[PDB]
């Protein structure tokens, strides 16, 4: 009745590794697909107060991931992530965004 799209890489969480005020582990749940077919992901990051978005390029996230330990984040400040997935090639008629996930890099002191 509508379109064709490889379903959101949903359940996007920013779970922090206890003490690590430099790192958030961004975890998500791939469409449904199992132990084959390469999925390519656009994970864009930035600070809570930024106008436009930065990037985690589809390199790590160029073959079906479901998790990524994001490193080099400013302490105590909220860094926010936005992801969607396409199936192998460039033909990918995008799945409507997984969601926004917003993570605070604990405290420096």
Swiss-Prot record:
Induction: LIF and OSM activate the type I OSM receptor while only OSM can activate the type II OSM receptor. Two extracellular parts of IL6ST/gp130 linked to the Fc-portions of a human IgG1 antibody (sgp130Fc) inhibit IL6 trans-signaling by the IL6:IL6R complex and has no affinity of IL6 or IL6R alone. Also blocks IL11 cluster signaling through IL11R. It comes from the Eukaryota. A motif (WSXWS motif) lies at residues 94-98. Found in all the tissues and cell lines examined. Expression not restricted to IL6 responsive cells. Glycans are attached at residue 11. Residues 8-108 form the Fibronectin type-III domain. Heavily N-glycosylated. Glycosylation is required for protein stability and localization in plasma membrane but not for ligand binding. The WSXWS motif appears to be necessary for proper protein folding and thereby efficient intracellular transport and cell-surface receptor binding. It is linked to Hyper-IgE syndrome 4A, autosomal dominant, with recurrent infections: An immunologic disorder characterized by recurrent mainly sino-pulmonary infections associated with increased serum IgE. Some patients have onset of symptoms in early childhood and develop complications, including bronchiectasis or hemoptysis, whereas others have later onset of less severe infections. Immunologic workup usually shows normal leukocyte levels, although some patients may demonstrate alterations in lymphocyte subsets, including T cells. Belongs to the type I cytokine receptor family. Type 2 subfamily. Component of a hexamer of two molecules each of IL6, IL6R and IL6ST; associates with the complex IL6:IL6R but does not interact with IL6. Forms heterodimers composed of LIFR and IL6ST (type I OSM receptor) which are activated by LIF and OSM. Also forms heterodimers composed of OSMR and IL6ST (type II receptor) which are activated by OSM but not by LIF. Component of a receptor complex composed of IL6ST/GP130, IL27RA/WSX1 and CNTFR which interacts with the neuroprotective peptide humanin. Interacts with HCK. Interacts with INPP5D/SHIP1. Interacts with SRC and YES. Signal-transducing molecule. The receptor systems for IL6, LIF, OSM, CNTF, IL11, CTF1 and BSF3 can utilize IL6ST for initiating signal transmission. Binding of IL6 to IL6R induces IL6ST homodimerization and formation of a high-affinity receptor complex, which activates the intracellular JAK-MAPK and JAK-STAT3 signaling pathways. That causes phosphorylation of IL6ST tyrosine residues which in turn activates STAT3. This is Interleukin-6 receptor subunit beta. It comes from Homo sapiens. The gene is IL6ST.
